[PDB]
Design an enzyme around this catalytic site. Structure first.
Site, mmCIF file in Angstrom:
data_model
loop_
_atom_site.group_PDB
_atom_site.id
_atom_site.type_symbol
_atom_site.label_atom_id
_atom_site.label_comp_id
_atom_site.label_asym_id
_atom_site.label_seq_id
_atom_site.Cartn_x
_atom_site.Cartn_y
_atom_site.Cartn_z
ATOM 1 N N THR A 1 0.831 -1.194 0.000
ATOM 2 C CA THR A 1 0.000 0.000 0.000
ATOM 3 C C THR A 1 0.869 1.249 0.000
ATOM 4 O O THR A 1 2.058 1.178 0.280
ATOM 5 C CB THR A 1 -0.946 0.021 1.209
ATOM 6 O OG1 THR A 1 -1.835 1.138 1.104
ATOM 7 C CG2 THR A 1 -0.164 0.128 2.496
ATOM 8 N N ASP B 1 -3.767 4.794 -2.530
ATOM 9 C CA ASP B 1 -4.185 3.919 -3.620
ATOM 10 C C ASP B 1 -5.436 3.134 -3.212
ATOM 11 O O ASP B 1 -6.068 3.423 -2.193
ATOM 12 C CB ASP B 1 -3.051 2.986 -4.027
ATOM 13 C CG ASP B 1 -2.648 2.042 -2.924
ATOM 14 O OD1 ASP B 1 -3.092 2.232 -1.777
ATOM 15 O OD2 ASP B 1 -1.892 1.093 -3.203
ATOM 16 N N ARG C 1 -5.813 -0.702 -3.957
ATOM 17 C CA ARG C 1 -5.705 -2.151 -4.070
ATOM 18 C C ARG C 1 -5.565 -2.797 -2.700
ATOM 19 O O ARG C 1 -4.829 -2.304 -1.843
ATOM 20 C CB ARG C 1 -4.504 -2.539 -4.931
ATOM 21 C CG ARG C 1 -4.233 -4.029 -4.965
ATOM 22 C CD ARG C 1 -2.948 -4.359 -5.692
ATOM 23 N NE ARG C 1 -3.068 -4.161 -7.128
ATOM 24 C CZ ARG C 1 -2.163 -4.553 -8.013
ATOM 25 N NH1 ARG C 1 -1.068 -5.192 -7.644
ATOM 26 N NH2 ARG C 1 -2.371 -4.308 -9.301
ATOM 27 N N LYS D 1 -9.077 3.798 1.856
ATOM 28 C CA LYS D 1 -8.071 3.873 2.905
ATOM 29 C C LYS D 1 -7.955 5.251 3.537
ATOM 30 O O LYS D 1 -7.040 5.471 4.332
ATOM 31 C CB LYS D 1 -6.707 3.448 2.362
ATOM 32 C CG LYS D 1 -6.720 2.150 1.598
ATOM 33 C CD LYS D 1 -5.320 1.761 1.188
ATOM 34 C CE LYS D 1 -5.341 0.580 0.253
ATOM 35 N NZ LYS D 1 -3.978 0.257 -0.222
ATOM 36 N N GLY E 1 -1.201 -1.242 6.951
ATOM 37 C CA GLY E 1 -0.969 -2.396 7.793
ATOM 38 C C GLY E 1 -2.140 -3.353 7.756
ATOM 39 O O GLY E 1 -2.743 -3.549 6.699
ATOM 40 N N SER F 1 3.902 -0.093 1.851
ATOM 41 C CA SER F 1 4.934 -0.892 1.196
ATOM 42 C C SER F 1 5.728 -0.059 0.201
ATOM 43 O O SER F 1 6.957 -0.165 0.136
ATOM 44 C CB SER F 1 4.308 -2.097 0.499
ATOM 45 O OG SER F 1 3.706 -2.973 1.432
ATOM 46 N N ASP G 1 5.871 -0.883 -7.318
ATOM 47 C CA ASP G 1 5.677 -1.855 -6.253
ATOM 48 C C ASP G 1 4.554 -2.818 -6.610
ATOM 49 O O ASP G 1 3.540 -2.428 -7.197
ATOM 50 C CB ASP G 1 5.362 -1.170 -4.926
ATOM 51 C CG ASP G 1 5.481 -2.110 -3.750
ATOM 52 O OD1 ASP G 1 5.829 -3.285 -3.963
ATOM 53 O OD2 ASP G 1 5.225 -1.677 -2.610
ATOM 54 N N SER H 1 0.927 -2.522 -4.608
ATOM 55 C CA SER H 1 0.148 -1.314 -4.819
ATOM 56 C C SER H 1 -0.392 -1.306 -6.240
ATOM 57 O O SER H 1 0.230 -1.854 -7.152
ATOM 58 C CB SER H 1 1.003 -0.072 -4.593
ATOM 59 O OG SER H 1 1.484 -0.020 -3.267
#
Lengths: 201, 215, 196, 196, 208, 219, 204, 196, 215, 196
Positions: free
Chosen positions: F1, F17, F19, F33, F47, F129, F166, F169
């Site tokens: 994330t 984001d 996902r 989020k 997390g 991440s 990444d 994400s």
């Protein structure tokens, strides 16, 4: 995996399923688990597929060399002894295989069981694989040495179907083989999804 | 090599119109101590090849010795043939993989740059034998910090010039200096072009600490 | 776990062993033979790990027969027992150990009957009666209670029947049939199987 | 252990302490950690005593034979690159860090450090040992270009004494050696002469 | 300690038709949560009528594909013929089993044309066991791609393949698998082997 | 994330984001989020998803009670205090990493809170991440006292770099702009990715499936 | 793993003014079958269902506690529950046992009792709601179902095409799973009727 | 982390760096590690950020309440004792080292060090943190009695810069604070002003 | 206390004709770093008792404040009763053993000296609750280096004098400085007599390094 | 390992269980009863860990009898099965878990015969025939092969005899005798023991 083999007046009969899995995922349902070593010998696979295939190819080439040298065909006991001696020298490294070896020779029909731990036993009725305990029941209740050919075919098919019904790693189609005096023949390959309506009604 | 001991941080590389440029800092850390502060981690192999390696430094020196002797021996013949960058990339991949399978690896990550026959080469070799090619490269933490910056530029403008690639290199070094714990403020650059291989350093980056006053 | 028993009388040796070959929780054979003939007057009974038993027994059989063929006379029971012990002891500390428990029964025209016991660590003992397995615990007390050095053949068979009935009553494993043999100055004789 | 070497125009200065412990017990307190590899080449040793002693003996043997063949005094670089291959070939076995220092007519007085792992590097001043973590800032702040032989014999003693007072594995006396063209000058600073 | 393996992702697919074969793959090379490259195909041309695809650990893929080509040249020099698809499969099985006690961490698929001009697909496991199939998918998203092929090609649970239909099916299954698999999809490489030789094609997928 | 936040001359910009994955398979493609905490305070969580959800809901209810009793708009320092104290009480078993932001009678404020109860007050922050790929962009292109549109473009670039570099994400980008006079909640702001068009027609015609039993229950 | 001890597969799909929920029928202990007609879909209202997959003991316990709470709620309030409220109730019930969690993953499917607007959602082990618009899956064969549904689902499905789609997806997905299958049960929830069907599947 | 405090006639000087890492990644590079417990008492913090922040908040609360009750400005010794009690009570949980420094009219400018374990001791100069192992010899050699207020800021800046150059966990800017009767003077040394 | 952290080295004690003498050095080591070099590890309990402790210093500081208040509280009663040297020995043994059994020990070794009613007391308390009495005592590495040296004197001459004991206690701080890696050259002495408790320090020892020249 | 089997016909329930109590490698008892009577028409068969079986079964029996005595009517088989499942599930996650496998057989005057299966994780299933033990593997295939929903009492006893003879032939454990009971609208009837 479930494979069975029994010996009666008119020869040996071998039956196997066809599913191969990798974990909980079913890789395929068209595996051929009766390995055709020669026009006069049969073997099965249980445990590791690669180990069974490799070592039975080695056995087939040794048998052909023996026949070329001695002008006579190898016997079932000698072939099983060779297979037993080629896997005892990798004892403890991690091989996993258990096979019936089926044939007909000067002493009549022959059915031996060899596995990687070291056992090598002759018998009149064998079953190996995960679902073998489900095939012992039906086979023991139905087996007799004076069976007819059709009755033996029916017994083998029913035992394999009952094994696949309650075992989760066993399924696919039932492949059947008959070992006679003048070589083996391939009898049938029946799908379980049709044996279900044949048997239940 | 089961343990790394003295190590290097990261190597950067990017290709432009007529050659390749590689950059690396001048620090060898022993754990968290920053012990040797003027070591060089960039090599010139032959007149069209350059190499930069991160990881254990003893292994890098050993490979310097082996590669240099191999180049000298092949040059003694005087037959008109010389190793290209791709030959060095392949030989390094073979050596790393052959040493992996004995369970005795060489703890390194290497970037090979070259320019031969009008075409430029930038290749990446790993500890286990994973090897590949790309328009831009960064090892270690530069894979996380610097790679996004290089790829953002390279997607919009696939073909750069020499000055643009240089400036991109200093920007990436500045970001790494800001955000990496094992970095240093003195780095070194190597450029391979039709003229040959040219090494420039040590250089330095200008930093900004304005945010310290909004705390 | 397999069961071996041997009883040694004034002019014979009686031996018995079970006939089960089991893998996991299912019996796969019920007429297994665990008794190897090394000579016209020597028997060697072996139990233990799978694979090691047959390899070790066949190696010993080949060497004993070769001694016979080269020299024109057969090995005595004592020399065969010592040969077996040396060959197991040598392999004990190498990379290919054998996990086997052994009984050796024989007859010599001058020294009489003989019965020998060997465990997997290659220590050789000579006994008037011996047993291997988990049934040894249940059986050795009956044998101590009812054995005399002058026992005869029919009395010995009766005592063996007592021991096997005790195994039937108390022991948790299914051991239906036993094979019995006797060794005497006329050779090796196969007796009727004891079945329940 | 604390060892150090400093370069000056015309030679090198080497210094060491003299304590060897086994746990928290001082096995030896007058140890000599400066060993002459050749008439003008010395090494300072830290780590396991067995490994360092054996490697020093082997390199002494090889360097002497090389010098006898070539009919010339050897170089400092040669001795450092003889230590480097033995330290790199057996890095999974040996635990030894070394400072090499000497004087050769070709490049004057030089100093190399071969740490654990078989690395090689040249430095103006080089410190090593377990107790050298406490004098990094001091030597960074105090060193300057153009020092004389007597301004290097006093800076070395100060750094070593400062390391001795704070480390538990360092102590004893201070042994100093100055290497230049004329020869090697050795001296010991006992308890009264140690800086306070 | 030291781990001799990593997982670099990748998906390979093969379909055998009446007089053709198709081998498809994706071109992303990854490691951990990072992306190494977006231009790393996984199909290698073995012969003018035989293609191989490998996925898994990348170093093993490179060394195995070099070994296979060396062996093919050895065979051609010794026997004065080009090796056949069945012979290639039978030799690869032995090569893979030679490393039984330190295995290759590779999944292999072989596609091509047999001696009567019909498509052939062979699938292997990391140890050597191989099998002739009609379609086969391997790699990261095998479990997602296999049921679609079973439904559409095998006609399972329902009351011949053209080349165009197979092409559309391959594109559709990779488009669908790019949606849900983390490791899959920057570009799609398709190799078609037929009577006239080997043809190549590329398609674009998602980038995130 | 990937979650990011920046402070400009008039307020706060936050971005994330969409996902959500479970292992190495994409579970949700339109996750949310950015969480409401107060009409002037917002939070972005990373997390474990359940822990961030419950933590934010609890803190939002507590601030609602406090603001009802006092009768005033709450402060970012209060929410920071309660969050950090609750997180420290649990000794790090709540895997929530939070980017908190808001504007009150003192001005724009932006905090970052870690799973063990740490806290930083900073002018720009990233977490997740793909936190390093966005921090590279912030280190490259941040200036003090930007305008609204410049800050929005900067946050979009950081989130896009995190998405594209990444594996954990992806999908869309969400932005939230907090200012003294307004609050904008853009959902979605950008759609960098689209699903390809299907080529075949796999529609199952009626009568393809065989049925054993059937029953009808008229409501 | 603990989620794979008993096996199981459940899924929900959304059409136009209708929803569909399907589950497999098998109870076994690892690799041995015990029974076939095991119940995994429970009704929580006139047009609202929940499906549980995972460990059988936790399946039954969660179903019974949820019915307890739902009955008390409906007696106090005097009205029918809403799908949002049921999802929040289940999330609360699952999070209460954090650090000791129930090993199940529910799937909820229903219609709004006031507007008859479809609702499907799924929760994870510790209760994180995840509301979709197309389809949700749960069980040991999630990858196969994702693959089948990404390719077969299309917007605005009438009850017949929705039934065919969900039947085909579930059948072809559980044909590739060793510890799931042996029968499929399908419920079609519509405005004015509910249709329950049992499919013909392989029994091996 | 590197923190330090020095005593001079009339007050104390406190200095710190500004880097907080998570592994090898610099999470924050403008951290403020000097926290005012009261008007003229400060603490410098090292270790886990959560533990130090929570303990500082708790002690701030307690000391403020005590001061309001007693109607007097508190002492440095009181705050050192409160920190000691909390650090000793939970030594199996907390990972925190602290330097307490302040000025009170009864005893002047004082500094105490509370390391891991809940010990407490008074010192003329006190260093702490992970990067303080590299400046023990420097501060031992350079410190002298009778330093002025302006001779203690330079000494602190030099020691902190030397620690910053060699440590991997230390970096950023240098934050200084001087505490005396008149008040507290705070300043920051950016990259150009840091000694080289 | 599962880990000792900052620790002390060793305490020495010996009884003479009319009192007791105890000695200990002024150093607290954090591992092998010698971090605090002016810390006192000797306490005066009341007008006839003195205490010396080795091991963890936080635990000693805790016991110091617990034992000071217990003495202060009893002197407030004004009744003519005071704790004997033996009462603190008995109380300390109980306090150690009660924490041994909770698996939360106090990492210390304690030496109590006293002189009351014309009879001298020297007692030893351990980490686990092992407690006893002897004419001479040494904890830590003094049990190996210094105890053989005192127990040779205390057999030829069972009854010493004040000067003979003061010389003996300083001959043992030199041997213990030569051969112990965690020692220091500054120690402190406490003496209890009919007058009361007298603390003297810091002192120092003169060393000899002649053997360094025979190497 | 113990063996339980149950078969459910049109108007009865037939149940059987073995009679061995074994400790280690020896049989302690050969007429053990594992069939608890909860009511005039409910039987509960339990196997598993030693100690847990009797405690759990007696707790259930006490509670069922108390329900009878308080209310004037008896619990139906379904309610007793649900009560048992809830009581095992509650204890699953506590500090005192029960390791027991259960079969419950009953008759209801309106719903007919009923047979229930429960494993040690407290998952309750309803089956027409069921088995527990290692012999379940060997027996369930015969039961699948030869069972019909319309089977009568004599045919059911014959089928049970087939299953037990299969256990005699193939299974490795010695299980000589089995106890058989039937539940019908007239209550619980004890049939003749099947012995070999």
């Amino acid at each position: 995996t479930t494979t069975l083999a029994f010996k009666f007046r008119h020869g040996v009969i071998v039956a196997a399923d066809s599913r191969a899995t990798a974990g909980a995922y079913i890789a395929s349902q068209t595996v051929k688990k009766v390995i055709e070593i020669n026009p006069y010998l049969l073997g099965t696979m249980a445990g590791g597929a690669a180990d069974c295939s490799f070592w039975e190819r080695l056995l087939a080439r040794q048998c052909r060399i023996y026949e070329l040298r001695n002008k006579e065909r190898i016997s079932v006991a000698a072939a099983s002894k060779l297979l037993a001696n080629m896997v005892y020298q990798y004892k403890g490294m991690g091989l996993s295989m258990g096979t019936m070896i089926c044939g007909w020779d000067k002493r009549g029909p022959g059915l031996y069981y060899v596995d990687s731990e070291g056992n090598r036993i002759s018998g009149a009725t064998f079953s190996v694989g995960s679902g073998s305990v489900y095939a012992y029941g039906v086979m023991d209740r139905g087996y007799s040495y004076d069976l007819e050919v059709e009755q033996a075919y029916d017994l083998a098919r029913r035992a394999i179907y009952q094994a696949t019904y309650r075992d989760a790693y066993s399924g696919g189609a039932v492949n059947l083989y008959h070992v006679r005096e003048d070589g083996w023949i391939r009898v049938s390959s029946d799908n379980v999804a049709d044996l279900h309506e044949k048997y239940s009604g | 090599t089961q343990n790394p001991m003295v190590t290097g941080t990261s190597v950067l590389g990017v290709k432009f119109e007529g050659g390749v440029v590689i950059a690396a800092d001048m620090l060898g850390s022993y754990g968290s101590l920053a012990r040797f502060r003027n070591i060089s981690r960039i090599m010139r192999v032959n007149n069209s090849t350059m190499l930069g390696a991160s990881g254990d430094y003893a292994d890098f020196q050993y490979l310097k010795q082996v590669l240099g002797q191999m180049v000298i021996d092949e040059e003694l013949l005087g037959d008109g043939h010389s190793y290209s960058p791709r030959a060095i990339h392949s030989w390094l991949t073979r050596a790393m993989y052959s040493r992996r399978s004995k369970m005795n690896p060489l703890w390194n990550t290497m970037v090979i740059g070259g320019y031969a026959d009008g075409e430029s080469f930038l290749g990446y070799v790993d500890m286990l034998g994973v090897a590949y090619e790309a328009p831009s490269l960064a090892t270690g933490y530069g894979a996380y910090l610097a790679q996004p910056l290089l790829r953002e530029v390279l997607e919009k403008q696939p073909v750069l010039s020499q000055t643009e690639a240089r400036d991109l290199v200093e920007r990436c070094m500045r970001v790494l200096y800001y955000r990496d714990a094992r970095s240093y403020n003195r780095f070194q650059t190597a450029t391979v072009t039709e003229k040959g291989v040219e090494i420039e350093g040590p250089l330095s980056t200008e930093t900004n600490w304005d945010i310290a006053h909004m705390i | 776990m397999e069961y071996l028993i041997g009883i040694q009388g004034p002019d014979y040796v009686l031996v018995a062993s079970d006939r089960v070959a089991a893998s996991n929780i299912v019996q796969m054979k019920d007429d297994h033979d665990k008794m190897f003939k090394m000579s016209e007057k020597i028997l060697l009974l072996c139990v233990g790990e799978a694979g090691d038993t047959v390899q070790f027994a066949e190696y010993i059989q080949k060497n004993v027969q070769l001694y016979k063929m080269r020299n024109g006379y057969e090995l005595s029971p004592t020399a065969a027992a010592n040969f077996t012990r040396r060959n197991l002891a040598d392999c004990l500390r190498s990379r290919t150990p054998y996990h086997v428990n052994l009984l050796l029964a024989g007859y010599d025209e001058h020294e009489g009957p003989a019965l020998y016991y060997m465990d997997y660590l290659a220590a050789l003992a000579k006994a008037p009666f011996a047993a291997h397995g988990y049934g040894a615990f249940l059986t050795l007390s009956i044998l101590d209670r009812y054995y005399t050095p002058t026992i005869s053949r029919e009395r010995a068979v009766e005592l063996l029947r007592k021991c096997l009935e005790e195994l039937q009553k108390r022991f948790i494993l299914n051991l239906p049939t036993f094979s019995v043999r006797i060794i005497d100055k006329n050779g090796i004789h196969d007796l009727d199987n004891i079945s329940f | 252990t604390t060892i150090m070497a400093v370069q000056f125009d015309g030679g090198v200065v080497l210094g060491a302490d003299s304590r060897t412990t086994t746990g928290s017990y001082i096995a030896n307190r007058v140890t000599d950690k400066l060993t002459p590899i050749h008439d003008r080449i010395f090494c300072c040793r830290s780590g396991s005593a067995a490994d360092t002693q054996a490697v020093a003996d082997a390199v002494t043997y090889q360097l002497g034979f090389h010098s006898i063949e070539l009919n010339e005094p050897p170089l400092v670089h040669t001795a450092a690159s003889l230590f480097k291959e033995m330290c790199y070939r057996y890095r999974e076995d040996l635990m030894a860090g070394i400072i090499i220092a000497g004087w050769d007519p070709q490049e004057g007085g030089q100093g190399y450090s071969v740490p654990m792992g078989g690395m090689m590097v040249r430095q103006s001043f080089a410190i090593g040992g377990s107790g050298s973590s406490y004098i990094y800032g001091y030597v960074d702040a105090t060193y300057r270009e153009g020092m004389t032989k007597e301004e290097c014999l006093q800076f070395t003693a100060n750094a070593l004494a400062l390391a001795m007072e704070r480390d538990g594995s360092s102590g004893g006396v201070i042994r100093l050696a100055a290497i230049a063209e004329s020869g090697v000058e050795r001296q010991v600073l006992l308890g009264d002469q140690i800086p306070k | 300690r030291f781990s001799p393996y990593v997982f670099n992702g990748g998906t390979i697919l093969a379909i055998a038709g009446e007089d053709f074969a198709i081998v498809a793959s994706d071109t992303r090379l990854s490691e951990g949560f990072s992306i190494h490259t977006r231009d790393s195909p996984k199909c290698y041309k073995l012969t003018d009528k035989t293609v191989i695809g490998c996925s898994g650990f990348h170093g093993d893929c490179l060394t195995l594909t070099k070994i296979i080509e060396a062996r093919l040249k050895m065979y051609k020099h010794s026997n004065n013929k080009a090796m056949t698809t069945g012979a290639i499969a039978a030799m690869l099985s032995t090569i893979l089993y030679s490393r039984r006690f330190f295995p290759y961490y590779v999944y292999n698929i072989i596609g091509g044309l047999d001696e009567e001009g019909k498509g052939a697909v062979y699938s292997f496991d990391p140890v050597g066991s191989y099998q002739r199939d009609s379609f086969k998918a391997g790699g990261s998203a095998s479990a997602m791609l296999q049921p679609l092929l079973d439904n559409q090609v095998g006609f399972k649970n329902m009351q011949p393949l053209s080349l165009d239909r197979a092409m559309r099916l391959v594109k559709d299954v990779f488009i669908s698998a790019a949606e849900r698999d983390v490791y899959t999809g920057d570009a799609l490489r398709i190799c078609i082997v037929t009577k006239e030789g080997i043809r190549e094609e590329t398609v674009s997928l998602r980038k995130d | 994330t990937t979650i990011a936040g920046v402070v400009y001359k008039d307020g706060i910009v936050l971005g994330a984001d969409t996902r959500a994955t479970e292992g190495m398979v994409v579970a949700d493609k339109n996750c949310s989020k950015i969480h409401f905490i107060s009409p002037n305070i917002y939070c972005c969580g990373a997390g474990t998803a359940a822990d961030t959800d419950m933590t934010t809901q609890l803190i939002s209810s507590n601030l609602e009670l406090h603001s009802l009793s006092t009768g005033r708009l709450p402060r970012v320092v209060t929410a920071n205090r309660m969050l950090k104290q609750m997180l420290f009480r649990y000794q790090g078993y709540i895997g929530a990493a939070l980017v908190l932001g808001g504007v009150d009678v003192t001005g724009p404020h932006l905090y970052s809170i870690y799973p063990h109860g740490s806290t930083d007050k900073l002018p720009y922050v990233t977490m997740g991440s793909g936190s390093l790929a966005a921090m590279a962009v912030f280190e490259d292109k941040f200036r003090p006292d930007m305008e609204e549109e410049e800050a929005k473009n900067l946050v979009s670039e950081a989130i896009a770099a995190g998405i594209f570099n990444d594996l954990g994400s992806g999908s869309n980008i969400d932005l939230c702009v907090i200012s003294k006079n307004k609050l904008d909640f853009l959902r979605p702001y950008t759609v960098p990715n689209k699903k390809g068009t299907r080529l075949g027609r796999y529609r199952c015609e009626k009568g393809t499936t065989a049925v054993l039993t059937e029953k009808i229950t008229p409501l | 793993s603990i989620m794979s001890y008993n096996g199981g597969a459940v899924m929900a799909m959304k059409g136009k003014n209708c929803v569909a929920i399907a589950a497999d029928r098998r109870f076994g202990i690892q690799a041995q079958m015990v029974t076939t007609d095991f119940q995994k879909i429970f009704p929580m209202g006139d047009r609202l269902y929940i499906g549980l997959a995972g460990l059988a003991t936790d399946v039954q316990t969660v179903a019974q506690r949820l019915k307890f709470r739902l009955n008390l709620y409906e007696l106090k309030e005097g009205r029918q529950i809403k799908p949002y409220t049921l999802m929040s109730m289940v999330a609360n019930l699952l999070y209460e046992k954090r650090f000791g969690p129930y090993y199940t993953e529910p799937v909820i499917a229903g219609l709004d009792p006031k507007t008859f607007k479809p609702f499907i959602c799924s929760l994870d082990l510790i209760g994180c709601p995840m509301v979709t618009d197309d389809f949700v899956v749960s069980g040991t064969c999630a990858e196969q179902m994702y693959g089948m549904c990404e390719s077969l689902w299309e917007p605005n499905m009438d009850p017949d095409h929705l039934f065919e789609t969900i039947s085909q997806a579930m059948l072809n997905a559980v044909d590739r799973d060793a510890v799931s299958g042996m029968g499929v049960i399908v419920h079609i929830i519509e405005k004015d009727k509910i249709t329950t069907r049992t499919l013909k599947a392989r029994m091996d």
